[PDB]
Design a protein around this nucleic acid. Structure first.
Ligand SMILES: N[C@H](Cc1c[nH]cn1)C(=O)N[C@H](CO)[C@H](O)c1ccc([N+](=O)[O-])cc1
Ligand SMILES: [K+]
Ligand SMILES: [Mg+2]
Ligand SMILES: [Mg+2]
Ligand SMILES: [Mg+2]
Ligand SMILES: [Mg+2]
Ligand SMILES: [Mg+2]
Ligand SMILES: [Mg+2]
Ligand SMILES: [Mg+2]
Ligand SMILES: [Mg+2]
Ligand SMILES: [Mg+2]
Ligand SMILES: [Mg+2]
Ligand SMILES: [Mg+2]
Ligand SMILES: [Mg+2]
Ligand SMILES: [Mg+2]
Ligand SMILES: [Mg+2]
Ligand SMILES: [Mg+2]
Ligand SMILES: [Mg+2]
Ligand SMILES: [Mg+2]
Ligand SMILES: [Mg+2]
Ligand SMILES: [Mg+2]
Ligand SMILES: [Mg+2]
Ligand SMILES: [Mg+2]
Ligand SMILES: [Mg+2]
Ligand SMILES: [Mg+2]
Ligand SMILES: [Mg+2]
Ligand SMILES: [Mg+2]
Ligand SMILES: [Mg+2]
Ligand SMILES: [Mg+2]
Ligand SMILES: [Mg+2]
Ligand SMILES: [Mg+2]
Ligand SMILES: [Mg+2]
Ligand SMILES: [Mg+2]
Ligand SMILES: [Mg+2]
Ligand SMILES: [Mg+2]
Ligand SMILES: [Mg+2]
Ligand SMILES: [Mg+2]
Ligand SMILES: [Mg+2]
Ligand SMILES: [Mg+2]
Ligand SMILES: [Mg+2]
Ligand SMILES: [Mg+2]
Ligand SMILES: [Mg+2]
Ligand SMILES: [Mg+2]
Ligand SMILES: [Mg+2]
Ligand SMILES: [Mg+2]
Ligand SMILES: [Mg+2]
Ligand SMILES: [Mg+2]
Ligand SMILES: [Mg+2]
Ligand SMILES: [Mg+2]
Ligand SMILES: [Mg+2]
Ligand SMILES: [Mg+2]
Ligand SMILES: [Mg+2]
Ligand SMILES: [Mg+2]
Ligand SMILES: [Mg+2]
Ligand SMILES: [Mg+2]
Ligand SMILES: [Mg+2]
Ligand SMILES: [Mg+2]
Ligand SMILES: [Mg+2]
Ligand SMILES: [Mg+2]
Ligand SMILES: [Mg+2]
Ligand SMILES: [Mg+2]
Ligand SMILES: [Mg+2]
Ligand SMILES: [Mg+2]
Ligand SMILES: [Mg+2]
Ligand SMILES: [Mg+2]
Ligand SMILES: [Mg+2]
Ligand SMILES: [Mg+2]
Ligand SMILES: [Mg+2]
Ligand SMILES: [Mg+2]
Ligand SMILES: [Mg+2]
Ligand SMILES: [Mg+2]
Ligand SMILES: [Mg+2]
Ligand SMILES: [Mg+2]
Ligand SMILES: [Mg+2]
Ligand SMILES: [Mg+2]
Ligand SMILES: [Mg+2]
Ligand SMILES: [Mg+2]
Ligand SMILES: [Mg+2]
Ligand SMILES: [Mg+2]
Ligand SMILES: [Mg+2]
Ligand SMILES: [Mg+2]
Ligand SMILES: [Mg+2]
Ligand SMILES: [Mg+2]
Ligand SMILES: [Mg+2]
Ligand SMILES: [Mg+2]
Ligand SMILES: [Mg+2]
Ligand SMILES: [Mg+2]
Ligand SMILES: [Mg+2]
Ligand SMILES: [Mg+2]
Ligand SMILES: [Mg+2]
Ligand SMILES: [Mg+2]
Ligand SMILES: [Mg+2]
Ligand SMILES: [Mg+2]
Ligand SMILES: [Mg+2]
Ligand SMILES: [Mg+2]
Ligand SMILES: [Mg+2]
Ligand SMILES: [Mg+2]
Ligand SMILES: [Mg+2]
Ligand SMILES: [Mg+2]
Ligand SMILES: [Mg+2]
Ligand SMILES: [Mg+2]
Ligand SMILES: [Mg+2]
Ligand SMILES: [Mg+2]
Ligand SMILES: [Mg+2]
Ligand SMILES: [Mg+2]
Ligand SMILES: [Mg+2]
Ligand SMILES: [Mg+2]
Ligand SMILES: [Mg+2]
Ligand SMILES: [Mg+2]
Ligand SMILES: [Mg+2]
Ligand SMILES: [Mg+2]
Ligand SMILES: [Mg+2]
Ligand SMILES: [Mg+2]
Ligand SMILES: [Mg+2]
Ligand SMILES: [Mg+2]
Ligand SMILES: [Mg+2]
Ligand SMILES: [Mg+2]
Ligand SMILES: [Mg+2]
Ligand SMILES: [Mg+2]
Ligand SMILES: [Mg+2]
Ligand SMILES: [Mg+2]
Ligand SMILES: [Mg+2]
Ligand SMILES: [Mg+2]
Ligand SMILES: [Mg+2]
Ligand SMILES: [Mg+2]
Ligand SMILES: [Mg+2]
Ligand SMILES: [Mg+2]
Ligand SMILES: [Mg+2]
Ligand SMILES: [Mg+2]
Ligand SMILES: [Mg+2]
Ligand SMILES: [Mg+2]
Ligand SMILES: [Mg+2]
Ligand SMILES: [Mg+2]
Ligand SMILES: [Mg+2]
Ligand SMILES: [Mg+2]
Ligand SMILES: [Mg+2]
Ligand SMILES: [Mg+2]
Ligand SMILES: [Mg+2]
Ligand SMILES: [Mg+2]
Ligand SMILES: [Mg+2]
Ligand SMILES: [Mg+2]
Ligand SMILES: [Mg+2]
Ligand SMILES: [Mg+2]
Ligand SMILES: [Mg+2]
Ligand SMILES: [Mg+2]
Ligand SMILES: [Mg+2]
Ligand SMILES: [Mg+2]
Ligand SMILES: [Mg+2]
Ligand SMILES: [Mg+2]
Ligand SMILES: [Mg+2]
Ligand SMILES: [Mg+2]
Ligand SMILES: [Mg+2]
Ligand SMILES: [Mg+2]
Ligand SMILES: [Mg+2]
Ligand SMILES: [Mg+2]
Ligand SMILES: [Mg+2]
Ligand SMILES: [Mg+2]
Ligand SMILES: [Mg+2]
Ligand SMILES: [Mg+2]
Ligand SMILES: [Mg+2]
Ligand SMILES: [Mg+2]
Ligand SMILES: [Mg+2]
Ligand SMILES: [Mg+2]
Ligand SMILES: [Mg+2]
Ligand SMILES: [Mg+2]
Ligand SMILES: [Mg+2]
Ligand SMILES: [Mg+2]
Ligand SMILES: [Mg+2]
Ligand SMILES: [Mg+2]
Ligand SMILES: [Mg+2]
Ligand SMILES: [Mg+2]
Ligand SMILES: [Mg+2]
Ligand SMILES: [Mg+2]
Ligand SMILES: [Mg+2]
Ligand SMILES: [Mg+2]
Ligand SMILES: [Mg+2]
Ligand SMILES: [Mg+2]
Ligand SMILES: [Mg+2]
Ligand SMILES: [Mg+2]
Ligand SMILES: [Mg+2]
Ligand SMILES: [Mg+2]
Ligand SMILES: [Mg+2]
Ligand SMILES: [Mg+2]
Ligand SMILES: [Mg+2]
Ligand SMILES: [Mg+2]
Ligand SMILES: [Mg+2]
Ligand SMILES: [Mg+2]
Ligand SMILES: [Mg+2]
Ligand SMILES: [Mg+2]
Ligand SMILES: [Mg+2]
Ligand SMILES: [Mg+2]
Ligand SMILES: [Mg+2]
Ligand SMILES: [Mg+2]
Ligand SMILES: [Mg+2]
Ligand SMILES: [Mg+2]
Ligand SMILES: [Mg+2]
Ligand SMILES: [Mg+2]
Ligand SMILES: [Mg+2]
Ligand SMILES: [Mg+2]
Ligand SMILES: [Mg+2]
Ligand SMILES: [Mg+2]
Ligand SMILES: [Mg+2]
Ligand SMILES: [Mg+2]
Ligand SMILES: [Mg+2]
Ligand SMILES: [Mg+2]
Ligand SMILES: [Mg+2]
Ligand SMILES: [Mg+2]
Ligand SMILES: [Mg+2]
Ligand SMILES: [Mg+2]
Ligand SMILES: [Mg+2]
Ligand SMILES: [Mg+2]
Ligand SMILES: [Mg+2]
Ligand SMILES: [Mg+2]
Ligand SMILES: [Mg+2]
Ligand SMILES: [Mg+2]
Ligand SMILES: [Mg+2]
Ligand SMILES: [Mg+2]
Ligand SMILES: [Mg+2]
Ligand SMILES: [Mg+2]
Ligand SMILES: [Mg+2]
Ligand SMILES: [Mg+2]
Ligand SMILES: [Mg+2]
Ligand SMILES: [Mg+2]
Ligand SMILES: [Mg+2]
Ligand SMILES: [Mg+2]
Ligand SMILES: [Mg+2]
Ligand SMILES: [Mg+2]
Ligand SMILES: [Mg+2]
Ligand SMILES: [Mg+2]
Ligand SMILES: [Mg+2]
Ligand SMILES: [Mg+2]
Ligand SMILES: [Mg+2]
Ligand SMILES: [Mg+2]
Ligand SMILES: [Mg+2]
Ligand SMILES: [Mg+2]
Ligand SMILES: [Mg+2]
Ligand SMILES: [Mg+2]
Ligand SMILES: [Mg+2]
Ligand SMILES: [Mg+2]
Ligand SMILES: [Mg+2]
Ligand SMILES: [Mg+2]
Ligand SMILES: [Mg+2]
Ligand SMILES: [Mg+2]
Ligand SMILES: [Mg+2]
Ligand SMILES: [Mg+2]
Ligand SMILES: [Mg+2]
Ligand SMILES: [Mg+2]
Ligand SMILES: [Mg+2]
Ligand SMILES: [Mg+2]
Ligand SMILES: [Mg+2]
Ligand SMILES: [Mg+2]
Ligand SMILES: [Mg+2]
Ligand SMILES: [Mg+2]
Ligand SMILES: [Mg+2]
Ligand SMILES: [Mg+2]
Ligand SMILES: [Mg+2]
Ligand SMILES: [Mg+2]
Ligand SMILES: [Mg+2]
Lengths: 48, 275
RNA sequence: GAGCUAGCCCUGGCCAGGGUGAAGCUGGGGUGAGACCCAGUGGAGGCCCGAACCGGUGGGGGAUGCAAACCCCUCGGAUGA
RNA sequence: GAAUGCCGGCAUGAGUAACGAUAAAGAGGGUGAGAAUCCCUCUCGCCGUAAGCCCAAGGGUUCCUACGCAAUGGUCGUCAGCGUAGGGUUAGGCGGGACCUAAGGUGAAGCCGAAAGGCGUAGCCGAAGGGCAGCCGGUUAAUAUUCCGGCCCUUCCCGCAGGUGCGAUGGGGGGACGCUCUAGGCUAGGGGGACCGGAGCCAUGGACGAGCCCGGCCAGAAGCGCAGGGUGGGAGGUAGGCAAAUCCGCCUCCCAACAAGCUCUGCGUGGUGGGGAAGCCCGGGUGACAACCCCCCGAAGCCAGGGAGCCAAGAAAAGCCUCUAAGCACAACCUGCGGGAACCCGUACCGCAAACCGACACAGGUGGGCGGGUGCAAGAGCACUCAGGCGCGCGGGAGAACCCUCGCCAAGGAACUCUGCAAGUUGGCCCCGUAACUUCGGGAGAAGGGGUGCUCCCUGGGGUGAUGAGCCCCGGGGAGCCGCAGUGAACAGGCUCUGGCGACUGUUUACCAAAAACACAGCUCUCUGCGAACUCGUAAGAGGAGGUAUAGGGAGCGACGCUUGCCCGGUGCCGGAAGGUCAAGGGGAGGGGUGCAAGCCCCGAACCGAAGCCCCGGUGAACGGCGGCCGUAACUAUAACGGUCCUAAGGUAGCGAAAUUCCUUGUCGGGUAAGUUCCGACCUGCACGAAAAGCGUAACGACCGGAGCGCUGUCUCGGCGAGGGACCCGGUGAAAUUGAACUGGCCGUGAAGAUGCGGCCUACCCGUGGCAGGACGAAAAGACCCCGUGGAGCUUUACUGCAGCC
RNA sequence: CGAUGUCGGCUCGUCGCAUCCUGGGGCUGAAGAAGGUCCCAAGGGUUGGGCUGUUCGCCCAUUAAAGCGGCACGCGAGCUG
RNA sequence: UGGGAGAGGGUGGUGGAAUUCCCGGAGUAGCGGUGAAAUGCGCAGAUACCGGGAGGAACGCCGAUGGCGAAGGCAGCCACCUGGUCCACCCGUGACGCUGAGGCGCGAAAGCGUGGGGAGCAAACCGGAUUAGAUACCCGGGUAGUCCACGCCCUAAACG
RNA sequence: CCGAGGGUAGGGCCCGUGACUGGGGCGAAGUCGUAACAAGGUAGCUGUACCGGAAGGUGCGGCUGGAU
């Protein structure tokens, strides 16, 4: 049957993307934390 | 004269439709329609604030002239009478000798080809608009302004009207469609006659589908819900109300007056509604 | 977190084929004029049968599955909320 | 040494289950160390509204070629979507951007919020909608509307010629729209041809034939033709389209009008450029100088912004045309022609799937287009089949039980069972015919029956032609032929009588409930006069509604018919300028602390002082309520009638052993040989009853009862047969579980149900196929039940706060 | 209570005997036939239907008879539900 | 042809008296009602009086032993549309007539449907009396209805 | 071919009968009240509507077949 992951590149960038995170207090704290932890990718990788 | 159907379906047995007799034009004036942003009952926060809305037919909003003192003394020919999906009344397209065109809501008795005019000097005939002070006490009247220059607010639905009952100073006393007796300022404009399409209220929707066409989604009784949802919720089997009948939000919905007590307009309402 | 799900908003798309035959219209009959009756025309409908499509009624299977809800046979809707 | 401990390693179950659709395989030839599994050929089977082909998501090199086989592949592997390497994606016209707006998002101005932030007209962003210029063929191992070939086209710059009051983010027109139905003419696609082109074939009894088999087109500027779309022309007036206007709007006048005219699209033709089968021979060559024509069918596509009808009344903005403003009028724009200029990103491959979502090469899920032929009334249904693609990545044998899916069965025919559950039966089309009841629609496919193939003969109307032949479509009458059987295969209702509940179509517990539940049109009460009520938000702002009482909110009830009684004492709501109670505040009789003092400071009575409660009244489709005792009538029984207690008042009409009835299988009647169910009655209704509506009601229902006819492996009662497993051999190889085990019966005993203790009995050692009685078998730290001064959801006249309102 | 699945049916039995039948007896208010009651006896047998989930029970038609109990109210790693 | 009388009918306008309710003023101890009473209303200011307003229904005097209509029935006033009827002239037609099974139309009140309207009245209903009782008669309340539109119902001591 | 009739299926009319139920006629020796006939103690009757143990009452409109 229809499962829960239905990938959609535009939906991905517009929801979790860098510019979405930076718009918002919570989103900037996400990037701070990812950077502080040393994450290699601050944001999901999506192709455009 | 409402139109009836033979019972060739279960729903056609009761369904009735307007007869659209007075209608003479089946196309809106292009310069006078604009897109009507459907809301679904949802406010600017995205939240339902009026339950059970949405999903009805697409509509263009026709710009209606609710001032009319906009063009004192400039007469106009009643060019057409059109259907309007945004109100119960029909609308009349006016061609002004000015060259300008606009709509008013169609009074009862308006005739395509007759002329109308607004102003302190206009004849007391159907379709004309005047400040309230120059209309004879006793005439029925519609599309009444509440305060001067603020637009027509009263008696706008199909078959409605107000009646001038007397004068008192700068003000004149109206009986609103609700039977309320109210002072309205005498410089407020109004339009002699009653609103047309009186047979509107005799329409039988007929089936659940017709409500849906109108944007009315199904309405769910409190008694059909659970206690998280509604005061009338829960109970084993059916249940009587078990408490004073209440809204989804807990206030009582039989009798409880809701008009604000210290409201300034109270000084101008002579007698609360009948019935 | 509404890429699942629920509702709404905007903008597009889909619904083989067959059946029933409302109003109206024309003709005739009728009448003082009508109502109305008959034929033909007409093509209405949360109309009928039935694929796509949407479902999930009863039974059987499956049960460390092909599958963390599937399969077969049956069955509901299919111009409409 | 234990924590159902943690991490790791390794056992057991066990050579066991399984190896993922039952569409299917066989042989020959090659390659190689090795072959059921790779390549090639022949034969067989499967899909063919796909299991074929195109596109969009998503995936991201999986594409092509060489060389490989450790691992991945459920086996094998020489093969591969795997390892290594190299190659491969070419655009002014295709898609997106350098264009437009939609919801929404953002947001100059502005508004609001402790901060963070929330809003917000314009503007901007935002597409699968608008707009916009490329078709056919050829070429590579791999790209092609991109390269090449042919024939076309768009925009920008510059120039020339002609023309014009040129000029815009401003005005206007236009863009610009629904659903159902549908005309005319075409095209796509298809069928046929005695005609045209073609390698060839004559079998096995016949056929050298009007024989078989194959093919008989595609693109194309201008011009022309056919068919459609769009559009009235001129003058005068002008106060409206936030400036101006010659434009548009409005008024009047004049020729014109279902015409033509002008304009645009489709289709055809069209210079020219292409393609071109079978068979044959090793993708290619040949066929071939290929032919390239006639007839029929014919779209849901095109002309198109076509037409009619209906109500639920059907985006925007730019491109484009026109108007004028500053400006500028040696400019600028328009038209034609010429030369130059024309950027960025995508393009491989998979794409109903082994490359996407599902941990898997997973029987599941995934939007758009094309989807041939014949037959069956039609069709995208069904069967078969084209092109095209496949045989589903373990095989070989065997022919037990048992399982699954399937076929048939004597006599009986529901006797099965909770229930005809399941499976039979019925089954399409044409004709005949068809009941109660009914809201006159229906019920209705009611029920029931007859017809159905093929051949010859005669004949009726239509479409295309021409009015005829030819073709194609709809029929009618007669005479015959064969079989068990003619919708001969496949797809395709069993029916009736009678109750309950719900009017109806709909909706729901994604994954145990589809219903009688929810919704529903309709009915009533109630709130709301508009800066509405109400909802969300601290606010601003929004919804409501660009609505205005024939409207909007809330609540109950639930089509329709006939109806909906009595009680307002309590509660709620509504009304009530009197009274009673009432907080802060006002007031300040009087009293107190201190000071030598003027003074400073504290307490404080009467009296005034809201809402709310108290008090008076109204109100039931507001919360709700709607009795008991004794007596009495020519026999008995009963009680119309009387008395009496109590109440706010004592249940009306209708209905009743009911979705309600305890006693209970009440009693009686019906149906049955037999009826705890069913239906019809009665009424001592444990414990119906009138909008948590009462009693009915045609039609409807995958709802839940009862009965009958038809027909059956449901059963008496079982038998045989088929295939997929089970079994045997080769290959690969799990699982929960497991204190260790050398693990028998009885009668006893034992923490009360013992392989393990006692006594006796029985018993050589070890497996395989089978069955499930035990190992208080496995699984899950019992959901029941209790306990914990454990938790959480929900309620209220529990307590105490808060929002909100007064 | 770190689980011992609960009514009824189906299937499959097996045991007890306080015996329903069949076999053997004594007593009788046993003439015969038929029955009553007690003793012995567990070898075999002990029907098909209607109603209801029913066990039970009632009823129909038969019968030599239409027995009653135990086996975790025998039996859900055997089925039903 | 020429005239007459009339609540004949239909539509629309419109005038005054009275009842009820509401606002203002003035006023106070009751009012109302009956056979007599009581319920009811009234110091929360009633009744009686004056001023203003709303709204519905019915039209006093004329009015009659009257008029008109086929019957049911029809009554302020005005206008329009329209029926029947009588009279005088004796002009025209030339038996064109009478009746009427079926048919069709009209048909008081009550009643029904849909929607308005609602003052007064008033079934049902509630209360007070009366009474042996009083599901009545009398009194105080009160919903349908009585009124308008449209469509039904088709009855009567529809009687002379 | 037609055909007595037989069989299958569905309709129409008629008669007999049925748990139970509706009122009616008669009986008369009962119980309740007294609706009508007098102004019958509320004049009567009336079509209709709503109500009540019962005769009946009330409403609306009608008739006199109404006493004073
Ligand atoms: N039926 C469950 C057994 C079960 C369910 N799942 C796993 N075991 C049950 O109640 N079991 C318990 C034993 O664990 C017990 O035998 C029991 C069985 C039945 C009853 N009862 O009153 O019908 C009570 C008790
Ligand atoms: K336990
Ligand atoms: Mg999706
Ligand atoms: Mg992904
Ligand atoms: Mg995307
Ligand atoms: Mg996208
Ligand atoms: Mg998205
Ligand atoms: Mg973003
Ligand atoms: Mg910061
Ligand atoms: Mg990581
Ligand atoms: Mg790094
Ligand atoms: Mg992140
Ligand atoms: Mg009309
Ligand atoms: Mg109708
Ligand atoms: Mg109709
Ligand atoms: Mg009709
Ligand atoms: Mg119908
Ligand atoms: Mg119906
Ligand atoms: Mg409408
Ligand atoms: Mg209509
Ligand atoms: Mg109209
Ligand atoms: Mg339109
Ligand atoms: Mg516009
Ligand atoms: Mg709008
Ligand atoms: Mg809006
Ligand atoms: Mg917004
Ligand atoms: Mg937001
Ligand atoms: Mg809503
Ligand atoms: Mg309208
Ligand atoms: Mg209307
Ligand atoms: Mg309605
Ligand atoms: Mg609508
Ligand atoms: Mg509802
Ligand atoms: Mg519920
Ligand atoms: Mg919630
Ligand atoms: Mg709560
Ligand atoms: Mg609550
Ligand atoms: Mg409740
Ligand atoms: Mg409940
Ligand atoms: Mg209950
Ligand atoms: Mg419930
Ligand atoms: Mg409930
Ligand atoms: Mg319910
Ligand atoms: Mg309750
Ligand atoms: Mg409130
Ligand atoms: Mg105001
Ligand atoms: Mg759209
Ligand atoms: Mg469809
Ligand atoms: Mg027809
Ligand atoms: Mg028509
Ligand atoms: Mg149709
Ligand atoms: Mg249909
Ligand atoms: Mg349908
Ligand atoms: Mg249908
Ligand atoms: Mg769906
Ligand atoms: Mg299923
Ligand atoms: Mg089945
Ligand atoms: Mg089966
Ligand atoms: Mg499962
Ligand atoms: Mg399936
Ligand atoms: Mg299936
Ligand atoms: Mg269907
Ligand atoms: Mg269809
Ligand atoms: Mg439908
Ligand atoms: Mg230890
Ligand atoms: Mg363990
Ligand atoms: Mg463990
Ligand atoms: Mg461990
Ligand atoms: Mg561990
Ligand atoms: Mg070991
Ligand atoms: Mg192992
Ligand atoms: Mg084993
Ligand atoms: Mg497996
Ligand atoms: Mg199969
Ligand atoms: Mg091999
Ligand atoms: Mg091969
Ligand atoms: Mg095909
Ligand atoms: Mg991937
Ligand atoms: Mg490639
Ligand atoms: Mg590769
Ligand atoms: Mg390998
Ligand atoms: Mg290998
Ligand atoms: Mg290697
Ligand atoms: Mg492997
Ligand atoms: Mg695998
Ligand atoms: Mg591979
Ligand atoms: Mg290479
Ligand atoms: Mg190019
Ligand atoms: Mg550029
Ligand atoms: Mg833009
Ligand atoms: Mg913002
Ligand atoms: Mg776009
Ligand atoms: Mg383009
Ligand atoms: Mg081209
Ligand atoms: Mg290439
Ligand atoms: Mg110009
Ligand atoms: Mg412009
Ligand atoms: Mg528009
Ligand atoms: Mg559009
Ligand atoms: Mg539609
Ligand atoms: Mg073509
Ligand atoms: Mg064809
Ligand atoms: Mg030969
Ligand atoms: Mg051509
Ligand atoms: Mg043509
Ligand atoms: Mg002008
Ligand atoms: Mg060739
Ligand atoms: Mg050649
Ligand atoms: Mg040649
Ligand atoms: Mg179609
Ligand atoms: Mg816009
Ligand atoms: Mg200038
Ligand atoms: Mg020009
Ligand atoms: Mg650039
Ligand atoms: Mg690029
Ligand atoms: Mg490419
Ligand atoms: Mg593939
Ligand atoms: Mg699929
Ligand atoms: Mg597809
Ligand atoms: Mg994969
Ligand atoms: Mg999975
Ligand atoms: Mg595979
Ligand atoms: Mg798959
Ligand atoms: Mg094709
Ligand atoms: Mg067929
Ligand atoms: Mg067919
Ligand atoms: Mg099918
Ligand atoms: Mg295979
Ligand atoms: Mg396989
Ligand atoms: Mg074997
Ligand atoms: Mg048999
Ligand atoms: Mg039978
Ligand atoms: Mg039989
Ligand atoms: Mg049954
Ligand atoms: Mg069958
Ligand atoms: Mg069939
Ligand atoms: Mg019948
Ligand atoms: Mg009928
Ligand atoms: Mg039939
Ligand atoms: Mg039937
Ligand atoms: Mg044959
Ligand atoms: Mg088949
Ligand atoms: Mg069928
Ligand atoms: Mg029936
Ligand atoms: Mg019912
Ligand atoms: Mg239901
Ligand atoms: Mg239903
Ligand atoms: Mg009903
Ligand atoms: Mg329904
Ligand atoms: Mg439907
Ligand atoms: Mg469920
Ligand atoms: Mg569930
Ligand atoms: Mg789920
Ligand atoms: Mg669930
Ligand atoms: Mg779940
Ligand atoms: Mg299920
Ligand atoms: Mg369910
Ligand atoms: Mg259902
Ligand atoms: Mg419901
Ligand atoms: Mg109703
Ligand atoms: Mg709030
Ligand atoms: Mg706002
Ligand atoms: Mg608003
Ligand atoms: Mg708005
Ligand atoms: Mg509104
Ligand atoms: Mg409901
Ligand atoms: Mg009562
Ligand atoms: Mg009360
Ligand atoms: Mg009360
Ligand atoms: Mg009270
Ligand atoms: Mg209470
Ligand atoms: Mg006070
Ligand atoms: Mg003092
Ligand atoms: Mg109470
Ligand atoms: Mg209640
Ligand atoms: Mg009771
Ligand atoms: Mg009973
Ligand atoms: Mg009942
Ligand atoms: Mg009960
Ligand atoms: Mg009990
Ligand atoms: Mg009972
Ligand atoms: Mg019982
Ligand atoms: Mg019985
Ligand atoms: Mg019994
Ligand atoms: Mg039963
Ligand atoms: Mg039952
Ligand atoms: Mg009884
Ligand atoms: Mg009892
Ligand atoms: Mg309720
Ligand atoms: Mg109920
Ligand atoms: Mg009826
Ligand atoms: Mg029914
Ligand atoms: Mg349904
Ligand atoms: Mg159902
Ligand atoms: Mg069998
Ligand atoms: Mg066989
Ligand atoms: Mg077999
Ligand atoms: Mg086999
Ligand atoms: Mg076999
Ligand atoms: Mg012991
Ligand atoms: Mg033992
Ligand atoms: Mg030992
Ligand atoms: Mg020992
Ligand atoms: Mg021992
Ligand atoms: Mg032994
Ligand atoms: Mg065992
Ligand atoms: Mg086993
Ligand atoms: Mg053991
Ligand atoms: Mg066990
Ligand atoms: Mg056990
Ligand atoms: Mg478990
Ligand atoms: Mg547990
Ligand atoms: Mg635990
Ligand atoms: Mg525990
Ligand atoms: Mg526990
Ligand atoms: Mg649970
Ligand atoms: Mg316990
Ligand atoms: Mg405690
Ligand atoms: Mg404790
Ligand atoms: Mg708690
Ligand atoms: Mg355990
Ligand atoms: Mg003897
Ligand atoms: Mg003895
Ligand atoms: Mg024995
Ligand atoms: Mg024995
Ligand atoms: Mg025995
Ligand atoms: Mg039994
Ligand atoms: Mg029993
Ligand atoms: Mg015998
Ligand atoms: Mg036992
Ligand atoms: Mg046990
Ligand atoms: Mg026991
Ligand atoms: Mg027991
Ligand atoms: Mg037992
Ligand atoms: Mg047991
Ligand atoms: Mg058991
Ligand atoms: Mg079980
Ligand atoms: Mg059991
Ligand atoms: Mg077992
Ligand atoms: Mg077990
Ligand atoms: Mg008089
Ligand atoms: Mg007279
Ligand atoms: Mg003469
Ligand atoms: Mg003569
Ligand atoms: Mg009448
Ligand atoms: Mg009446
Ligand atoms: Mg009143
Ligand atoms: Mg008494
Ligand atoms: Mg009534
Ligand atoms: Mg009424
Ligand atoms: Mg008389
Ligand atoms: Mg015979
Ligand atoms: Mg009397
Ligand atoms: Mg008397
Ligand atoms: Mg009397
Ligand atoms: Mg009584
Ligand atoms: Mg009375
Ligand atoms: Mg009379």
């Amino acid at each position: 049957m229809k499962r829960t992951w239905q990938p959609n590149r535009r939906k991905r960038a517009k929801t979790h993307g860098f510019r979405a995170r930076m718009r918002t207090p919570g989103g900037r704290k996400v990037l701070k934390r990812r950077r502080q932890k040393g994450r290699w990718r601050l944001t999901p990788a999506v192709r455009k | 004269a409402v139109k009836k159907f033979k019972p060739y379906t279960p729903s056609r047995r009761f369904m009735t439709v307007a007869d659209f007799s007075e209608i003479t034009k089946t196309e809106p004036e292009k310069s006078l329609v604009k897109p009507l942003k459907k809301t679904g009952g949802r406010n600017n926060q995205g939240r339902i604030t009026v339950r059970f809305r949405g999903g009805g037919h697409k509509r263009l909003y026709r710009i209606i002239d609710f001032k009319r003192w906009d063009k004192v003394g400039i007469p106009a020919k009643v060019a057409a009478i059109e259907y309007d999906p945004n109100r119960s009344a029909r609308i009349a397209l006016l061609h002004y000798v000015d060259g300008e065109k606009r709509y008013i809501i169609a009074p009862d008795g308006l005739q395509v080809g007759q002329q109308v005019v607004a102003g302190p000097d206009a004849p007391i005939q159907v379709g004309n608009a005047l400040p309230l002070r120059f209309i004879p006490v006793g005439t029925v009247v519609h599309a009444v302004e509440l305060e001067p220059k603020k637009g027509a607010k009263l008696a706008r639905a199909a078959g409605t009207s107000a009646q001038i009952q007397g004068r008192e100073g700068d003000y004149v006393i109206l009986r609103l469609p609700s039977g309320e007796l109210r002072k309205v300022h005498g410089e407020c404009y109004a339009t002699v006659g009653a609103v047309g399409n009186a047979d509107h209220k005799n329409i039988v929707l007929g089936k659940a589908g017709r409500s849906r066409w109108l944007g009315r989604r199904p309405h769910v009784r409190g008694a059909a819900m659970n206690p998280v949802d509604h005061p009338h919720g829960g109970g084993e089997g059916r249940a009587p109300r078990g408490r004073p009948p209440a809204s989804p939000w807990g206030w009582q919905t039989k009798g409880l007056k809701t008009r604000k007590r210290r409201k300034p307009s109270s000084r101008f309402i002579i007698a609360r509604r009948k019935k």
